[PDB]
Design a protein around this ligand. Structure first.
Ligand SMILES: [Zn+2]
Ligand SMILES: [Zn+2]
Ligand SMILES: [Zn+2]
Ligand SMILES: [Zn+2]
Lengths: 620, 187, 586
RNA sequence: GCGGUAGUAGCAUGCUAGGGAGCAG
RNA sequence: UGACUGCUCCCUAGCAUGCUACUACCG
């Protein structure tokens, strides 16, 4: 916290990898042997050799990934399009990358129009499209990192919030795992800079034996390996005409982070009934269970949800270090105090203050999260609970203590000041008590910076529990954004569900003999997903009828809506799947004398294959 | 099945039973006509249900061993591509201007952000508009990073050569504007 | 782990172990060479051995398959499978199988422990690939026999030309002479530091090399055995007689350096390969210089095998040839640097087999083929493959340093493939014009093997002296001595003024070093001293056994001197087949 | 009259792998 | 050029279990 403030006095060219000249069989190389963090100060690698002869595989992967050799053999760069610090230009030309429009499925649009859709003055319009971009799109999206400003925190308050936050993560287990216990899905995805030139992640997961991976992982508990991140534009449907970019981190980072965090990140995704609902499904009654767990036993309940403006770009650098220290609290037997620092500096050097590749040039990231790191959705949920617990501390400590009529919420306000500003060590009897007070009067459900709260509505009006106005003050001094109270909602009647969670609306239907909660989408999102696609995909529906069975599953709970213009989106998808099947079994009978049997195909235009996805007693 | 070591018994028992059908067979020899190809047939089926398992097992190592070969051949093609890089990005270090800052260093460690800034030969400047151009790159020479650079080429976004006279105050609306100036170090 | 069966070349994946170098025996061919010999181990993409708990059962022939590992009988899972069966060891590519009836040689070559001449006779009657494999395994067994030596630990040094060296316990002193160049590598703390090219004299100690190192504490003297690379390209190619001269440009004028060279161009330019069969001192050093200048429009190269024999090719090069027009190569082993170094584009390239650049050519010369093993020809053909080449040398010289064969003598023909292929189909040429040499050698080599095809040129003035002294030989330790040699040399120079400015020949360097310690004479090599013979020389007895002087060792040693040749009899050597002068000893 | 044992064919469930596709943050 | 996770539908190949008829020996 002090280094954050003192590092704004020193030149910005002194922060980053510290390089030195080594010799590998009589030739001079420049390699990184340390780091200078604005927060953690100067760190020096522990195993550096100046005179070597032969480089192994595990010693070439650590020399190719380092930015020390790429940014010491390229041209100087002065980029006036952006205000971020710029390091080098790796080639002689600047790359300008654009985004193409979408493809039009004219058959589906004709079919929909011939069935009374898209009339003038209709409730359902088209609002989700494929937006095109010009060559000034990647740098204009990178330049949104000017919203990350140095932020000193209140340390006596944060050192208590971090202890109420590590109680939402007590029901899990975690630790380090060997290279033969690591689970990887879709090995056919990129592998970063210096490597996307030679293959995908499969090549590097096959070329490396288990012992090579173990040696690489144990190398980073004593050394620091900086890497390069590549910014990639996205090609997807949306409602805003702004570009979306993701960060593809390197393979030396992902490979070694998956052995550090994956045992805990898969026990979070396996717990049902907790605050973090990552892993739970919306199908087979899951959305009813999730909504009846958050409702718990609160009293006078109201529902609330808020927004995080510019969440990844504006998040401070001290609430991102605090999320890696809560996830690493599970490694308390497997790793030592010194092994858990070099696995923290290794995270900062790779996903917090790294060097990014935008075009053909290297820039310096000021701070903020990277979508592409392993623990993202899981580190975004630690930050979401930390900002909602400090809103409840600021709401109770700024309340006139003479007007509190209750006597339990008057000594709980008198011991919280002591625990914050008059104590120096952890008191594990008021933390367990504040954590129960919150769970009783302020119940949350969190999914990676999406949150829904059921709260006492006669305590938030008196001032003993956080409100929407208490989230607008915490985001102003702790997050450097202004949260307008027109992106947050509130709900008084609990028989209508949350207004929105995970882009889905809620509705109470009658199913069987009992009333349940069902999620339904935005009709313009499901309609606009059949009209606009990516060629050969759905510019011919017969070559993929599975796209429309997976889009009628999402459109099913629209049949229960009181609006009859919403309930027609499901019957339009069941009538098109039959059209695409009569054609297919009738196009292979007039050009090739083939006769297909319609047995076990009629289930996809009947409203009983889709009704079984929203009823308990799971199958498959 | 022509080499299973239990075909002889089966073959003989078939011949004894089947071929001797026309000949008058009493109710006592019929047992031999019946319980001789039986049991032998059971054993043969046992000798064929194990052969079928040995074959499949075998044809699961003559496929898992092509894959161990494939990968090692591949491991030797990437191990020789990173090597051919880290030795081509090295013959490019003007080792007179680089051994002059690693030497003035206290221990030989220097920040990496000052190596291209003080030991590079070429500069690339990317300029958005005309106003930025006259405050950064006016004339044929300009100073930046405590040095003096002399302009060598001005390409544009389309990558077509621009001249330093097309860049006016009023001809500016007629150029693809992200302009890229390439300059060389002086003295 | 997939390649050419040494024999069939089809793609295999196997490879024995017995075979130190580990060739890629095919599938089938393993069944022969695996059962038909102690050779049992086998390594394919994965190694074959009872993976069962710390076992130790191998001979695949017995090991069985199963599961996904292997198990002999050790603990063969219920679903086993013989690894070995129907003439084939289970291995990748099984239908491209073939094998070939060639385990014949293959088995003798594999089993040959290299102790008798029969090893070389059977090694030299096979096919091309078998020849390559045999040469490779011979060089392998010899270097791995030669590296069986310890280290020399040195901590202090008194002064120059003196050193107290002591070998390890149980390891004998490495051999005296310089045929094994002492390329040592000491240690400082972690790695190998350079020492320099060295050579020992005796157990005073004169350093006959050109270097100076700061030897002192912690010095470790070692013998460096280079890891030999596998040979790929063939050693030769069958020829074919053409009619059209392609590319070659005969000169408008006549470079009348020699007279008989016109027949050399007429006979050599036609066929795809030949050999300059020239008697000693009959133009075996500068005919290629004439071919270089008679064909200036043809790319011409020269390779050598020894650093010493660079005198004749250098003196006339400075006398009548330029400097820039030629080219030389030397890495940073050591040699003259007069000419241009690192020039891949030139017309007169001099190089040595240690290191050559990958390039093709059209005419090459290869000096001292008789010193060179088949591996040397194969490596100089693989590193530099050219259209035509001529092997300077003659089979009637000394054998190569094959210290592996002792009891049996080495006949010419079995020196290499060329030294017999040129005997069977006939020699391509024969010369008899000695530039600077009396006719004593002419008569000797005409009576011995030439059958008197070339006749005396210079008058036999009967100036050669031969006596009837035999001498006595005695062995005491690893180094040998000869008591009737310290006095015999003195007794022979008692009253002869002519040889007061003469040189000394050293068949055995130990006796020469001892005599130089007693009296003092310059040391001269016997093997790597062809073309460097001094005008006035003395031949010493120096030996009484069949180790070196049996038939083919004196033919080049009795022609060193030009005018005064004093060659005393040393053994039953041709004594009673001709006449000879004799100065009566006092 | 029945039970056990070893093959063979046929119908569903769960799990482990590969392939294509849909949605969410 | 194509990141990290989670859920879910459809198709093919292999493994074990669950009610049957067929074999055949054995009771
Ligand atoms: Zn750990
Ligand atoms: Zn072998
Ligand atoms: Zn065993
Ligand atoms: Zn073969």
């Amino acid at each position: 916290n002090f280094n954050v403030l003192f590092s704004t006095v020193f030149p910005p060219t002194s922060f980053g990898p510290l390089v030195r000249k080594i010799f590998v069989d009589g030739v001079p190389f420049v390699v990184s042997t340390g780091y200078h963090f604005r927060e953690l100060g100067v760190v020096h690698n522990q195993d550096v050799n100046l005179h070597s002869s032969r480089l192994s595989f595990k010693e070439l992967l650590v020399y190719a990934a380092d930015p020390a050799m790429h940014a010491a053999s390229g041209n100087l760069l002065l980029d006036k399009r952006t205000t971020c610090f710029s390091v080098a230009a790796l080639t002689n030309n600047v790359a300008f990358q654009t985004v193409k429009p979408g493809n039009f499925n004219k058959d589906f649009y004709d079919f929909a129009v011939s069935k009374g859709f898209f009339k003038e003055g209709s409730s359902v319009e088209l609002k989700h499209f494929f937006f095109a971009q010009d060559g000034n799109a990647a740098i204009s999206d990178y330049d949104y990192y000017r919203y990350n400003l140095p932020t000193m925190c209140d340390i006596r308050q944060l050192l208590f919030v971090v202890e109420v936050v590590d109680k939402y993560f007590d029901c899990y287990d975690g630790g380090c795992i060997n290279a033969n216990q690591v689970i990887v899905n879709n090995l056919d995805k990129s592998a970063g800079f210096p490597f996307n030139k030679w293959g995908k992640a499969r090549l590097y997961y096959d070329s490396m034996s288990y012992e090579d991976q173990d040696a690489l992982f144990a190398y980073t508990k004593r050394n620091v390996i900086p890497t390069i991140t590549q910014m990639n534009l996205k090609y997807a449907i949306s409602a805003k005409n702004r570009a979306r970019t993701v960060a593809g981190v390197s393979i030396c980072s992902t490979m070694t982070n998956r052995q550090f965090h994956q045992k805990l990140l898969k026990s979070i995704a396996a717990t049902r009934g907790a605050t973090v609902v990552i892993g739970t499904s919306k199908f087979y009654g899951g959305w009813h269970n999730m909504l009846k767990t958050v409702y718990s036993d609160v009293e006078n309940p109201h529902l609330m949800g808020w927004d995080y403006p510019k969440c990844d770009r504006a998040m401070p650098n001290m609430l991102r270090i605090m999320a890696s220290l809560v996830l690493a609290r599970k490694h308390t037997t497997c790793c030592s105090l010194s092994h858990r620092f070099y696995r923290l500096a290794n995270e900062c050097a790779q996903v917090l203050s790294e060097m990014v590749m935008c075009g053909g040039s290297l820039y310096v990231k000021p701070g903020g999260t990277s979508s592409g790191d392993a623990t993202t959705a899981y580190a975004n949920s630690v930050f979401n609970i930390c900002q909602a617990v400090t809103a409840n501390v600021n709401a109770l400590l700024s309340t006139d203590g003479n007007k509190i009529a209750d006597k339990y919420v008057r000594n709980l306000q008198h011991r919280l000041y002591e625990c914050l500003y008059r104590n120096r060590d952890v008191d594990t009897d008021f933390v367990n008590e504040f954590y129960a007070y919150l769970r009783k009067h302020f119940s949350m459900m969190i999914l990676s910076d999406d949150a829904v709260v059921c709260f006492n509505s006669t305590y938030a009006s008196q001032g003993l529990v956080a409100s929407i106005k208490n989230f607008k003050s915490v985001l102003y001094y702790q997050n450097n954004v202004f949260m307008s109270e027109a992106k947050c909602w509130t709900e008084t009647d609990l028989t209508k569900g949350p207004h929105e969670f995970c882009s889905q609306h809620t509705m109470l239907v009658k199913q069987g003999d009992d009333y349940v909660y069902l999620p339904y989408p935005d009709p313009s999102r499901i309609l606009g997903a059949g009209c606009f696609v990516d060629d050969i995909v759905k510019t011919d529906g017969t070559l993929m009828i599975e796209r429309f069975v997976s889009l009628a599953i999402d459109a099913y709970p629209l049949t229960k809506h009181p609006n009859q213009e919403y309930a027609d989106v499901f019957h339009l998808y069941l009538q098109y799947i039959r059209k695409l099947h009569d054609e297919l079994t009738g196009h292979m009978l007039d050009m090739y004398s083939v006769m297909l049997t319609n047995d076990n195909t009629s289930r996809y235009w009947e409203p009983e294959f889709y009704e079984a996805m929203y009823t308990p007693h799971t199958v498959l | 099945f022509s080499s299973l070591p239990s075909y002889a018994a089966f073959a003989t028992a078939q011949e004894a039973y089947e071929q001797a059908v026309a000949n008058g067979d009493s109710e006592v020899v019929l047992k031999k006509l019946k319980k001789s190809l039986n049991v032998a047939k059971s054993e043969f089926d046992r000798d064929a249900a194990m052969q079928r398992k040995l074959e499949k097992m075998a044809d699961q190592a003559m496929t898992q061993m092509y894959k161990q070969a494939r990968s090692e051949d591949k491991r030797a093609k990437v191990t020789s591509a990173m090597q051919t890089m880290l030795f081509t990005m090295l013959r490019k270090l003007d080792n007179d201007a680089l051994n002059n800052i690693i030497n003035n260093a206290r221990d030989g460690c220097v920040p990496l952000n000052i190596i291209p800034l003080t030991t590079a030969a070429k500069l690339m400047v990317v300029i958005p508009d005309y106003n930025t151009y006259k405050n950064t790159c006016d004339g044929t020479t300009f100073t930046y990073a405590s040095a003096l650079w002399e302009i060598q080429q001005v390409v544009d976004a389309d990558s077509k050569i621009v001249q330093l006279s097309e860049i006016s105050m009023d001809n500016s609306p007629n150029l693809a504007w992200p302009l890229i100036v390439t300059a060389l170090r002086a003295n | 782990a997939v390649g050419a069966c040494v024999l069939c070349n089809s793609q295999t994946s196997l490879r024995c172990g017995a075979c130190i170098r580990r060739p890629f025996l095919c599938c089938k061919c393993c069944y022969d060479h695996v059962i038909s010999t102690s050779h049992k181990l086998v390594l394919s993409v994965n190694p074959y051995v009872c993976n069962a708990p710390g076992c130790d059962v191998t001979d695949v022939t017995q090991l069985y398959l199963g599961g996904m590992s292997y198990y002999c009988k050790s603990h063969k899972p219920p679903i086993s499978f013989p690894l070995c069966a129907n003439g084939q060891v289970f291995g990748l590519y099984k239908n491209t199988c073939v094998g070939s009836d060639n385990v014949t040689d293959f088995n003798a070559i594999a089993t040959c422990d290299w102790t008798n001449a029969g090893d070389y006779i059977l090694a030299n009657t096979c096919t091309e690939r078998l020849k390559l494999f045999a040469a490779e395994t011979l060089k392998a067994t010899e270097e791995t026999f030669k590296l069986s030596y310890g280290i020399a630990t040195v901590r202090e040094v008194l002064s120059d030309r003196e050193l107290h060296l002591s070998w390890e316990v149980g390891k004998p002193r490495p051999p005296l002479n310089r045929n094994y160049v002492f390329t040592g590598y000491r240690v400082t703390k972690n790695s190998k530091v350079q020492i320099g090219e060295y050579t020992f004299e005796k157990g005073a100690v004169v350093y006959r090399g050109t270097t100076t190192y700061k030897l002192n504490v912690g010095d470790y003297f070692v013998l460096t055995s280079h890891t030999v690379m596998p040979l790929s390209a063939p050693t030769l190619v069958p020829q074919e007689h053409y009619v059209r001269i392609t590319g070659l440009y005969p000169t408008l004028n006549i470079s009348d350096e020699f007279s008989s060279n016109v027949a050399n161009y007429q006979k050599v330019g036609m066929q795809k390969y030949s050999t300059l069969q020239g008697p000693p001192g009959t133009g075996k050093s500068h005919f290629a210089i004439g071919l270089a200048l008679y064909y200036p429009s043809a790319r011409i190269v020269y390779t050598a095998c020894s650093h010493a024999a660079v005198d004749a090719l250098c003196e006339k090069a400075l006398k009548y040839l330029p400097i820039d027009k030629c080219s030389r190569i030397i890495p940073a082993v050591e040699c003259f640097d007069k000419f241009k170094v690192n020039s891949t584009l030139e017309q007169y390239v001099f190089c040595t087999v240690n290191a050559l650049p990958e390039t093709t050519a059209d005419i090459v010369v290869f000096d001292e083929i008789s010193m060179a093993t088949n591996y040397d020809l194969s490596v100089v053909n693989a590193r530099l493959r050219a259209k035509h080449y001529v092997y300077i040398g003659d089979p009637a010289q000394l054998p190569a340093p094959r210290t592996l064969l002792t009891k049996g003598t080495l006949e010419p023909e079995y020196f290499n493939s060329v030294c017999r292929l040129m005997k069977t189909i006939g020699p391509d040429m024969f010369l008899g014009t000695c530039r600077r040499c009396p006719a004593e050698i002419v008569d000797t080599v005409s009576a011995l093997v030439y059958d008197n095809k070339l006749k005396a040129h210079k008058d036999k003035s009967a100036q050669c002296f031969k006596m009837f002294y035999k001498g006595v030989i005695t062995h005491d330790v690893s180094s040998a001595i000869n008591r009737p040699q310290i006095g015999v040399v003195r007794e022979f120079l008692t009253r002869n003024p002519a040889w007061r400015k003469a040189v000394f020949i050293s068949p055995y360097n130990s006796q020469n070093a001892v005599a130089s310690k007693i009296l003092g004479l310059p040391t001269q090599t016997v093997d790597s001293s062809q073309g460097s013979e001094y005008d006035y020389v003395i031949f010493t007895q120096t030996t009484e056994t069949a180790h070196s002087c049996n038939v083919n060792r004196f033919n080049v040693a009795i022609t060193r001197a030009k005018v005064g040749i004093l060659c005393i009899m040393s053994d039953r050597d041709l004594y009673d087949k001709l006449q000879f002068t004799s100065l009566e000893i006092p």
